[PDB]
């Protein structure tokens, strides 16, 4: 759809369980593990996939492709190996707190840590 002038949208759900599936095929080939027994090329796994989601110019049709991956953290750990390899790729974040979901605020969006860099200039002037 992107190369033929249409707009698409894809939700990967989730990229955490992909990287525990690439870990299994790597260690079953006897490859040297790294941090958290992961292989050395986990960054090649998620960068070569999320680089395709782009917007072509008007001479190429004018389509687009938006991505929205999902990462699951273990007890608020936003300083682990996998949730930092994907923060350093995507153009922003949306944080969901497990201790605002218990207090009755839903959707529990952490407004302090949620940022979107490039998408701020493209919104409605009414909004």
């Amino acid at each position: 759809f992107r190369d033929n002038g249409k707009h698409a949208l894809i939700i990967y759900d989730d990229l955490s369980k992909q990287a525990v599936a690439y870990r299994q095929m790597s260690l079953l080939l006897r490859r040297p593990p790294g941090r958290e027994a992961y292989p050395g090329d986990v960054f090649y796994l998620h960068s070569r996939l999320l680089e395709r989601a782009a917007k072509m110019n008007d001479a190429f049709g004018g389509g687009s492709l938006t991505a929205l991956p999902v990462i699951e953290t273990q007890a608020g750990d936003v300083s682990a190996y996998i949730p930092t390899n994907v923060i350093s790729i995507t153009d922003g974040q949306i944080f969901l707190e497990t201790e605002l979901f218990y207090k009755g605020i839903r959707p529990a969006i952490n407004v302090g840590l949620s940022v979107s860099r490039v998408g701020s200039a493209a919104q409605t002037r009414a909004m």
Partner: protein, 465 residues
């Protein structure tokens, strides 16, 4: 036939000539006293397979003779398996004669397809007032049972067997994954003295599968599959609403990471196997609600080193739909069953699943049980009478609610002398809808202790004085 070339520990290598068997088959060693079943796991090339044993390996000579079944491990299945005890290969281990039945089934079987799943959530009712109101049970889901010994856990097992066979008509299977012999003998005789198993006729309600603790590490991992084949017979052939008990699920994970290290594989994170997420996948996806019937599972969960983010209690937590926790601090308060009402959660607790009548009743119960938890500290440190008159009723009502959650069980009729009550769903919602509004507040506290519905509560206030 084949021949044994290598014997290293609990790993035997078998050399064939023509009929090379595929993976997940089952061989059988010829010349020994008891059955020794080998399970093929790898094709090593030049007609040689890599097998894991299921019993003792000593006495095996290089160059013996080994047959082939041509199929996986096939167990005796049927309706006449109710009330017997078997190991992982279907043999009976209680010296009551051979089990005789019509058909057999294989334990390594695929999941149901995508077009056979249920498209809607549905609540399973078990009769207990604390379970079916605050942490209800979905039909087909996986349940985690927190708590251990000395809390009253083995009664709650023996009573959920009895109530489903009364209100729903579905039997159960018990699978002991690496369990102690001393504690797997007392559960045999505790079920006899409560009626759910019976040595005289065909009114039994369970089938026991016991793979005990002193068995080789390949034989403690397949027990949760043998005890799931039997549970699939009563859904695929008769269409019942079966239960399933695994005790526990950590000894299924830990017994997996000793086969995957005897086979020469690089370990993953902290010591587990590389395949920690598919062995939990290719077991717990067979526990589902198809179009014929369902299988519901209650599993015991042991957390190692009090780490909730260890990979063994983190893989399991993505499969559960409801958790119930047995607190010992409610067992010293006198309440039975000792289920904590505040620290139990359910995923199907939702206004678009169980409706708005169940919701706003069970929402207010956990809110009022928090206010008594916060006001019990000012009373213990400072004193009693300083708090307002609007708060004295919340102290009085929350001692009515947390005693109305008690319920006498049918499995304990001989000992505590009371009558076992099985409460349906529409009585438990009607009851707590009136305690919150102050409708039955003038009656004293002991009218609510150990009754059935709300009707038998006011019939007990008359007998006082």
């Amino acid at each position: 036939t084949g021949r044994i070339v290598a014997v290293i520990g609990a790993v035997v290598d078998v050399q064939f000539d023509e009929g090379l068997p595929p993976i997940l088959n089952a061989l059988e060693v010829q010349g020994r006293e008891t059955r020794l079943v080998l399970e093929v796991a790898q094709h090593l090339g030049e007609s040689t397979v890599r097998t894991i044993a299921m019993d003792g390996t000593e006495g095996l000579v290089r160059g013996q003779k080994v047959l082939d079944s041509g199929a996986p491990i096939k167990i005796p299945v049927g309706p006449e398996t109710l009330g017997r005890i078997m190991n992982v290969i279907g043999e009976p281990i209680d010296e009551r004669g051979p089990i005789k039945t019509k058909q057999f089934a294989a334990i390594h079987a695929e999941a149901p397809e995508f077009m056979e799943m249920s498209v809607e959530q549905e609540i399973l009712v078990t009769g207990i007032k604390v379970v079916d109101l605050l942490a209800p049970y979905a039909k087909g889901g996986k349940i985690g049972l927190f708590g251990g010994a000395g809390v009253g856990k083995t009664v709650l097992i023996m009573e959920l067997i009895n109530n489903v066979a009364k209100a729903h008509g579905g039997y159960s299977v018990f699978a002991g994954v690496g369990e102690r012999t001393r504690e797997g003998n007392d559960l045999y005789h505790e079920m006899i003295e409560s009626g759910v198993i019976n040595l005289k006729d065909a009114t039994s309600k369970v089938a026991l599968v016991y793979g005990q603790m002193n068995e080789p590490p390949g034989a403690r991992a397949r027990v949760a599959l043998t005890g799931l084949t039997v549970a699939e017979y009563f859904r695929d052939q008769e269409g019942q609403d079966v239960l399933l008990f695994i005790d526990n699920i950590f000894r299924f994970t830990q017994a997996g990471s000793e086969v995957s290290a005897l086979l020469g594989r690089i370990p993953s994170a902290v010591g587990y196997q590389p395949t920690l997420a598919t062995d939990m996948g290719t077991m717990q996806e067979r526990i589902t609600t198809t179009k014929k019937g369902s299988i519901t599972s209650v599993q015991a969960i042991y957390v190692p080193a009090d780490d909730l983010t260890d990979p063994a209690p983190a893989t399991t937590f993505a499969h559960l739909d409801a958790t119930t926790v047995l607190s010992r601090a409610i067992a010293e308060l006198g309440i039975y069953p000792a289920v904590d009402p505040l620290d139990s959660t359910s995923r199907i607790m939702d206004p678009n699943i169980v409706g708005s009548e169940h919701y706003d009743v069970a929402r207010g119960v956990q809110k009022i049980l928090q206010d008594y938890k916060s006001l019990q500290d000012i009373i213990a440190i400072l004193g009693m009478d300083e708090l307002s008159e609007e708060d004295k009723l919340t102290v009085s009502r929350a001692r009515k609610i947390q005693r109305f959650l008690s319920q006498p069980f049918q499995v304990a009729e001989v000992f505590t002398g009371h009558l076992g009550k099985l409460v349906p769903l529409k009585e438990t919602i009607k009851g707590f809808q009136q305690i919150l509004a102050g409708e039955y507040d003038h009656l004293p506290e002991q009218a609510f202790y150990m009754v059935g519905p709300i009707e038998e509560a006011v019939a007990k206030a008359d007998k006082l004085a």
